[PDB]
Amino acid sequence: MHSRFQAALTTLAADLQAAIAPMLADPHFPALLEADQVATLQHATGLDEDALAFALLPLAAACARPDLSHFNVGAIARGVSGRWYFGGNMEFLGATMQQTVHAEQSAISHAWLRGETSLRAITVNYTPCGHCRQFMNELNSGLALRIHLPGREAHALEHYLPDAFGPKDLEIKTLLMDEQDHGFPVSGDALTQAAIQAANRCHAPYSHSPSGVALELKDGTIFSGSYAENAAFNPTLPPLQGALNLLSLNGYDYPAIQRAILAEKADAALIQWDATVATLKALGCHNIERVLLG
Amino acid sequence: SRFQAALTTLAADLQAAIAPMLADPHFPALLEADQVATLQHATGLDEDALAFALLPLAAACARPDLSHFNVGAIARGVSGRWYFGGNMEFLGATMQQTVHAEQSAISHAWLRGETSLRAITVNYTPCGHCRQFMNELNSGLALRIHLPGREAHALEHYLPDAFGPKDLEIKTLLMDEQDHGFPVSGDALTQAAIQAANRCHAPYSHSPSGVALELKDGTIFSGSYAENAAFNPTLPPLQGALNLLSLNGYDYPAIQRAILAEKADAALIQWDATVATLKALGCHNIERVLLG
Ligand SMILES: [Zn+2]
Numbered sequence: 058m059h060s061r062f063q064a065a066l067t068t069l070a071a072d073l074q075a076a077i078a079p080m081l082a083d084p085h086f087p088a089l090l091e092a093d094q095v096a097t098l099q100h101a102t103g104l105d106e107d108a109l110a111f112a113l114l115p116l117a118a119a120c121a122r123p124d125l126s127h128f129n130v131g132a133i134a135r136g137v138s139g140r141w142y143f144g145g146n147m148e149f150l151g152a153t154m155q156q157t158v159h160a161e162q163s164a165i166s167h168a169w170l171r172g173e174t175s176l177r178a179i180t181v182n183y184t185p186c187g188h189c190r191q192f193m194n195e196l197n198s199g200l201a202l203r204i205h206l207p208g209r210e211a212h213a214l215e216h217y218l219p220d221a222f223g224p225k226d227l228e229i230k231t232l233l234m235d236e237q238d239h240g241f242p243v244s245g246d247a248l249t250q251a252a253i254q255a256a257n258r259c260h261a262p263y264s265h266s267p268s269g270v271a272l273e274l275k276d277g278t279i280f281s282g283s284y285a286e287n288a289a290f291n292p293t294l295p296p297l298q299g300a301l302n303l304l305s306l307n308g309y310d311y312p313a314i315q316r317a318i319l320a321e322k323a324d325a326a327l328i329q330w331d332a333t334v335a336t337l338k339a340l341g342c343h344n345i346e347r348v349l350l351g
Numbered sequence: 352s353r354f355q356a357a358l359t360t361l362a363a364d365l366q367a368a369i370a371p372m373l374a375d376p377h378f379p380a381l382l383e384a385d386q387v388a389t390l391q392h393a394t395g396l397d398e399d400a401l402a403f404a405l406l407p408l409a410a411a412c413a414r415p416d417l418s419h420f421n422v423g424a425i426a427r428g429v430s431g432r433w434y435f436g437g438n439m440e441f442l443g444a445t446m447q448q449t450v451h452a453e454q455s456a457i458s459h460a461w462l463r464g465e466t467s468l469r470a471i472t473v474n475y476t477p478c479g480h481c482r483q484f485m486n487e488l489n490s491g492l493a494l495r496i497h498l499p500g501r502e503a504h505a506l507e508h509y510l511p512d513a514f515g516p517k518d519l520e521i522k523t524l525l526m527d528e529q530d531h532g533f534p535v536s537g538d539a540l541t542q543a544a545i546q547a548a549n550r551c552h553a554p555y556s557h558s559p560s561g562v563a564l565e566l567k568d569g570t571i572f573s574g575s576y577a578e579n580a581a582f583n584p585t586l587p588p589l590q591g592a593l594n595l596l597s598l599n600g601y602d603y604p605a606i607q608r609a610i611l612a613e614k615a616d617a618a619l620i621q622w623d624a625t626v627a628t629l630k631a632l633g634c635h636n637i638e639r640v641l642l643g
């Protein structure tokens with residue numbers, strides 16, 4: 058009868074608890090809401106969209122894995138499709154600060170890896186840090202993305218990132234979440250296809266090093282992550298983190314991993330192999346193999 | 352002579368005043384206060400205009416091996432010393448191992464014992480990663496950021512509604528004096544690595560680490576771990592040592608021996624990233640010294 062949501066649920070208004078309870082019954086609730094589910098919660102609570110997003114933040118934060126700090130952070134990315142995607146921060150004991158995932162990166166890559174074409178807004182509890190402001194300026198929403206914070210007026214990303222640097226200053230015209238297909242041939246079994254398709258839609262205009270990770274779980278589920286570079290370089294999200302983000306957001310723990318594949322080019326400018334191996338080993342996963350692109 | 356090209360870009364008077372200061376092949380990529388004063392006398396520039404004019408020399412120190420876009424920065428210490436920085440990118444590694452020019456210059460001043468910075472001068476607006484990095488320093492949001500053809504501004508101007516160590520109630524900020532007290536012993540390179548760990552900044556994980564590199568001619572360069580309140584802009588200890596190595600006019604083939612000092616059972620572990628990055632740079636003599 059375990060549930061990562063129970064304690065957080067007690068902190069929610071009674072009407073929202075009742076409304077979302079049928080949606081959270083599945084232990085592997087996908088930590089996203091279809092547009093019709095957003096409408097159902099609005100009807101069952103009377104909240105407008107901004108207030109409902111704020112009210113849901115404790116459930117997103119309850120998905121987080123702050124194994125080092127114990128400080129749960131949540132975020133909700135609102136797609137133009139009308140779907141909303143939860144994110145939570147992730148920290149990895151035995152790895153490094155560079156492997157950590159902020160809640161904003163978690164929610165944004167959640168939307169992107171589920172095929173959302175762009176975001177209209179993001180809702181958080183605390184002002185995104187400079188690393189996240191730089192991450193968001195990679196997106197096709199650019200400086201116009203609406204940032205929603207409790208008890209304050211909504212503002213565009215421009216408000217938080219004066220004199221911004223981003224892909225346009227590098228004359229990049231295909232932005233993160235724009236449609237991309239690098240055309241590597243897809244073949245093999247379900248997990249191999251997934252890893253190659255993840256690499257095919259990755260965002261890497263600075264190093265031209267495509268990469269993707271796919272994980273196959275004990276119950277047969279596959280989650281994949283696509284590499285997402287950033288104009289400022291360091292806020293880049295590696296492909297492993299995207300896959301681990303989805304795995305955790307979907308209610309799994311790292312021992313659920315039964316197979317793991319990294320698809321990349323063995324002689325690309327940048328190589329994800331070593332960090333992928335190291336971070337998986339920190340999580341107790343020793344089973345990782347490479348599918349070679351090109 | 353990695354400065355020869357950049358030197359041709361300077362005004363004649365500045366060229367003639369500084370070209371002697373760059374005489375030694377391993378010019379330490381910093382200027383003493385008396386050297387800044389000499390350059391000011393020989394050009395009549397105020398310190399802001401001099402720093403702007405010196406940015407091509409700092410940028411000449413950079414190693415943008417991926418992008419080929421050199422970025423320079425000049426960190427003005429409260430001592431009056433100026434410290435050059437340049438960006439570093441590492442082929443065969445990842446985007447996470449990158450060092451921004453601002454991080455380079457601040458790390459330079461810090462590892463040379465500068466107590467705090469009064470300002471930083473750059474040619475391009477610092478990115479959000481660098482704005483967050485700079486909010487770790489004991490100069491806080493008041494640090495002055497100087498950009499060409501722009502009004503100078505506090506870091507507060509570039510990072511509204513900032514998050515930093517002060518929000519986590521950290522009272523020992525980056526560049527404040529720290530000494531974690533681990534016992535120093537062994538050969539010179541081992542002691543350098545332990546000393547590097549003793550002055551590192553790690554209030555979030557309490558995972559101390561330092562790296563020391565021994566070059567073929569016997570020179571040792573070390574780097575201390577520097578965490579960041581936002582976590583990801585953290586500078587690993589290896590990056591600090593490679594920064595110093597390159598800024599002082601060396602290339603990675605000169606590395607003969609490398610040591611990481613850290614706690615075996617620490618919450619965060621630098622060993623695997625350190626080995627993998629050094630291996631991408633052709634160094635395979637890497638040992639680990641364990642802190643109590
Ligand atoms: Zn952040």
Ligand SMILES: [Zn+2]
Nearest residue numbers: 451477478481
């Ligand atoms: Zn930067």
